[PDB]
Ligand binder design. Sequence first.
Ligand SMILES: Nc1ncnc2c1ncn2[C@@H]1O[C@H](COP(=O)(O)OP(=O)(O)NP(=O)(O)O)[C@@H](O)[C@H]1O
Ligand SMILES: Nc1ncnc2c1ncn2[C@@H]1O[C@H](COP(=O)(O)OP(=O)(O)O)[C@@H](O)[C@H]1O
Ligand SMILES: [Mg+2]
Ligand SMILES: [Mg+2]
Lengths: 293, 269
Amino acid sequence: LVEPLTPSGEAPNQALLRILKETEFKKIKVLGSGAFGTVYKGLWIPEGEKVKIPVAIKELREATSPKANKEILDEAYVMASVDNPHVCRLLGICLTSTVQLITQLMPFGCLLDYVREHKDNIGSQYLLNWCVQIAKGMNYLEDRRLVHRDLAARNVLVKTPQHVKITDFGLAKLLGAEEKEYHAVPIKWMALESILHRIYTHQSDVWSYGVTVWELMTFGSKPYDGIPASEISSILEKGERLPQPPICTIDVYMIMRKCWMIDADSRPKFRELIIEFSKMARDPQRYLVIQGD
Amino acid sequence: VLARIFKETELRKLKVLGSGVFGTVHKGVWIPEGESIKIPVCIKVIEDKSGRQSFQAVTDHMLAIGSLDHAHIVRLLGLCPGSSLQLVTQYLPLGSLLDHVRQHRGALGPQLLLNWGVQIAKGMYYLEEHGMVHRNLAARNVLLKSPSQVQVADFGVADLLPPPIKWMALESIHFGKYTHQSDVWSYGVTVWELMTFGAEPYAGLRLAEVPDLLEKGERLAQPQICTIDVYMVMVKCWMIDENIRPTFKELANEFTRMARDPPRYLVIK
Ligand SMILES: Nc1ncnc2c1ncn2[C@@H]1O[C@H](COP(=O)(O)OP(=O)(O)NP(=O)(O)O)[C@@H](O)[C@H]1O
Ligand SMILES: Nc1ncnc2c1ncn2[C@@H]1O[C@H](COP(=O)(O)OP(=O)(O)O)[C@@H](O)[C@H]1O
Ligand SMILES: [Mg+2]
Ligand SMILES: [Mg+2]
């Protein structure tokens, strides 16, 4: 007759995946390149609607396998599902020989590049606000039960110096109400359990968060440089973590140390991080020593 | 499994039911040898455009079509050779799935829509495992056996004639290449028809180059009752690269998983 009711309840994902044609958007120049494909800058011109939308066009090499394709499609799924001021949302995809994700352009682009180029124009109150906004975005991602398995300065975009967002989602996985862990990658940003047991959680993205904030406070320095990804494991086993950035106080670096604790439940939550860094943001010269200010 | 062969005297055509791209379907009757019984059947007449006078004898392809039976495909009762080919099947009064979903629309259960997806994928999987290519899958070619059962019809009919644009894959349009994966494309369009309650694919557009647009990156828009989860499947069915497209078993399995929790994947009020 018909096959089992077996209900789980839960809300349906009614995210709209608008499909665009290649002739509706133009390519201007390259923003990124690699084996993943190519990220372009361009102008989106909608059908009948005419506001001209500066967009990033992430176009990827055609799929090797039947679902080599759909991790790309899962990325599109996630980028279409999320809705947040601090998370970059999909505006649509172009389905052809190569799949093209389309997002809104961020003029200043990568944050990792930004904290490098503008090394001595960045103040207290910008870094702290960036940390706050990232915490908020990641907290939204936590509320949607999806884990950002690749949080770093590389994957944070800059709309304006006062506004940043989160992206990639290429490794992001959605947790069911069932699951509490995800068991399956950048070693120097992952938590210890992600390296040893391949376990990914929301508290893993907290470790990644700590490393991100570390990249920001060190103005775009490379984590554990000189140390091969080869068994960075062991150094953590010793209990050695990332050094304290020159501009950080003992309280900020305490939060950084807090995100890198072995016990996942001992680590802070994104809500907590929002509260703390928003607290610090009301008197930034007290928590960060910068002589430019 | 077994192909039955009819004599022209065993068949009779009563009323024209309709004509499509390939043949003309008559509601007719079966009067076997020596009997006086009239058994209601469906006789589809295909005109021999071979030139070699090829429908006077039972070919291998005819045997291939007649040697198929499944719970979710329309079994071919018999065939009748001659100047014109006559394909005899059961007469399903409930009509096509297209006219049905257009008729009841939202009133039908989402469970039924998903399960129908599963059934169509079932029949297509059976057809594929026996090397049978459909070449004309659509909502119009899906008939209701039961109010809960649907069956795939008009399979193998296309390659009876010498060498539907809105249900065909790109390679089929450009190069006349027909594969099981083209049947996957056609399946995706069929499900689009199903869940949009009988909407016309590419309505505002004209045929002249629906293919252009498909190559430009456009597909059929997301159905108003469809979650992103269900629309993603149709999307993958409409992929240009042939072995990126899903297989019919994967399709059946995922529509089964969705059939396990209908309101989570279809929103009708
Ligand atoms: N077994 C059947 N029982 C009842 N009606 C049938 C049956 N098979 C076909 N029909 C009807 O036949 C009519 C026209 O037949 P036909 O032209 O071969 O199909 P079609 O709807 O035109 N699709 P197609 O020809 O493959 O493009 C349709 O209205 C069908 O509902
Ligand atoms: N919307 C955007 N605006 C500006 N730059 C972007 C945008 N999307 C991607 N980029 C560029 O691409 C990089 C991020 O791409 P990402 O989504 O992380 O893909 P991947 O990590 O798979 O290469 C950043 O360095 C950024 O400069
Ligand atoms: Mg990245
Ligand atoms: Mg028909």
